[PDB]
Amino acid sequence: MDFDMIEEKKDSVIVRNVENFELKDIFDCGQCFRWHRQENGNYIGIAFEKVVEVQKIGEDVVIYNINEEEFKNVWSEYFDLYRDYGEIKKELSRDPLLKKSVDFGEGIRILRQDPFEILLSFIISANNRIPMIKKCINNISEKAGKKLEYKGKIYYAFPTVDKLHEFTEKDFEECTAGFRAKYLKDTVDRIYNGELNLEYIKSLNDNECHEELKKFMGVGPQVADCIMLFSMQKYSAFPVDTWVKKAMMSLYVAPDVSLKKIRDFGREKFGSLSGFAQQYLFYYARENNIQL
Numbered sequence: 001m002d003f004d005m006i007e008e009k010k011d012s013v014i015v016r017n018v019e020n021f022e023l024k025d026i027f028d029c030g031q032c033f034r035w036h037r038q039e040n041g042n043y044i045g046i047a048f049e050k051v052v053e054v055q056k057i058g059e060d061v062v063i064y065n066i067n068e069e070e071f072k073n074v075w076s077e078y079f080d081l082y083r084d085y086g087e088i089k090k091e092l093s094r095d096p097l098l099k100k101s102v103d104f105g106e107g108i109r110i111l112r113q114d115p116f117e118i119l120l121s122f123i124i125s126a127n128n129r130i131p132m133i134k135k136c137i138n139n140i141s142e143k144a145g146k147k148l149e150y151k152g153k154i155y156y157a158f159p160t161v162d163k164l165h166e167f168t169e170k171d172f173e174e175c176t177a178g179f180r181a182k183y184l185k186d187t188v189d190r191i192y193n194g195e196l197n198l199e200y201i202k203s204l205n206d207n208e209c210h211e212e213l214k215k216f217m218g219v220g221p222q223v224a225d226c227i228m229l230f231s232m233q234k235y236s237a238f239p240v241d242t243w244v245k246k247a248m249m250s251l252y253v254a255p256d257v258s259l260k261k262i263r264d265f266g267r268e269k270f271g272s273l274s275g276f277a278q279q280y281l282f283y284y285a286r287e288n289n290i291q292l
């Protein structure tokens with residue numbers, strides 16, 4: 001594990017000697033939308049119908065609003081704290097071309113998020129901008145999510161499948177999903193009616209899992225890779241957007257080809273570490289706003 005032990009406190013849990021764990025790297029590397037940076041450096045987020053605040057002090061991490069039982073069954077896995085990222089980075093850094101990206105995002109960890117929330121979140125992410133995506137997801141939660149309180153503030157859990165089934169295309173449109181409102185509604189019904197089952201989809205191997213997810217309206221190859229990587233731990237995924245495409249052409253002189261071919265080229269080169277590889281690539285590419 002990438003931590004030595006924990007210690008339960010009054011209203012929190014302290015993780016001792018965490019390794020490969022930085023707040024900005026984890027929360028701003030592109031994998032999540034409901035974690036917000038606070039004035040003091042901490043981050044507050046809403047996941048699994050719960051509000052959590054995370055802080056790093058030295059080599060320790062404090063997770064407020066949770067107990068040891070919650071840490072053991074929910075959060076330790078949420079933060080993928082059982083996987084050794086030192087090995088991942090060591091293996092990838094063998095490629096001198098990846099070192100710079102890996103070192104820049106050294107504290108990245110791929111969270112184990114909820115499939116349903118992730119499915120709708122990334123359908124919303126397609127050709128969108130960060131602000132609109134976050135706004136839309138929050139709007140959907142405020143409108144139909146369980147109300148929550150933390151330190152004098154109200155927050156909204158992500159809505160259940162049943163509550164969202166009540167939504168009309170117009171509702172998603174009012175939350176500003178734009179033309180994607182149609183995809184959200186179509187997708188929620190497929191979930192509700194039982195046509196597509198997320199937990200079953202998640203039990204399939206990387207390639208099968210991927211194919212199924214593409215059955216959802218608004219879900220193409222890129223979005224499918226994001227969904228299975230971020231919520232179904234299918235590590236051979238290699239999400240290709242314009243940022244990953246740039247970093248890829250720039251480093252391996254890959255010629256301008258389809259996203260599918262860039263995806264095939266990435267997965268071929270990184271295998272089981274493809275997902276981790278693209279996150280480092282993506283994070284570095286976007287924060288440094290690289291060009292041809």
Ligand SMILES: Nc1nc2c([nH]c(=O)n2[C@H]2C[C@H](O)[C@@H](CO)O2)c(=O)[nH]1
Pocket residue numbers: 029030031125126127128129130226239240241244278282
């Ligand atoms: N390849 C890739 N693309 C992503 C991720 N997260 C994310 O939002 N995107 C896309 C969505 C949208 O196309 C743009 C938003 O910055 O980047 C992500 O984690 N990986």
